[PDB]
Recover the amino acids of this structure.
């Protein structure tokens, strides 16, 4: 589809058997999800933006379905105020900026 | 143009007669630029990112050129890690997401 930017580009995603709303974020190198209890091993990480840094847990090879498009890659989980789909997964679903 | 997301969507912008590099950021409601001198009046404002809130200078109705596309709107100037172009200006240049 085509998504305009009048409002926040929120879309439904499916991860770990749960449906969630997430932001298609071309400014996010990586995908950062709100706190959730995923299984498997993880590695600590810190990511920075406006306001400073937050601590997150890096999970690798996590399947996410974004508007019916399947993608698999690294997913960070931490105290983010918003679910954020980053470029690592946006590429896998063929997402592009256009103007 | 059509922009894939395998690399950061960085572009050259023109503001206040100066050229700069900025990130097209669909996850940003507003445009936030690094510290710089801009002509005209400004009023203090606060914005929140993933790491907390920062103090910024709000410049209204600022002319800014993004890849030869003109925009006029609000520009926030503060300690952001990166020059980011938010939806307030991406809409002015007709920017959409497509997959
Ligand atoms: C360094 C580039 C940019 C600041 C990075 N951010 C993605 C943004 O899209 C962020 C994503 C975001 C969106 C809402 C709340 C927290 C973060 N939005 C944002 O900060 O926008 C601010 C400016 O306009 C306002 O509108 C929203 C907040 C304000 S981020 O959230 O901090 C981030 C996301 C993934 C990362 O992986 C390495 C690293 C950093």
């Amino acid at each position: 589809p085509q998504i305009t930017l009048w409002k926040r580009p929120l879309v439904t995603i499916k991860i770990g058997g749960q449906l969630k709303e997430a932001l298609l974020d071309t400014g996010a190198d990586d995908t950062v999800l709100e706190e959730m209890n995923l299984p498997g091993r993880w590695k600590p990480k810190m990511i920075g933006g406006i306001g400073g840094f937050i601590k997150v847990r890096q999970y690798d090879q996590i399947l996410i379905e974004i508007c019916g498009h399947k993608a698999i890659g690294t997913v960070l989980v931490g105290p983010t105020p918003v679910n954020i789909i980053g470029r690592n997964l946006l590429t896998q679903i063929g997402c592009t900026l256009n103007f």
Observations:
- The beta strands of chain A are 2-3, 10-15, 18-24, 31-33, 43-49, 52-66, 69-77, 84-85, 96-98.
- The interface with chain B takes residues 1-6, 8-9, 23-29, 32, 47-54, 67, 69, 80-82, 84, 87, 90-91, 93-99 of chain A (CB under 8 Å).
- Chain A has one domain: 1-99.
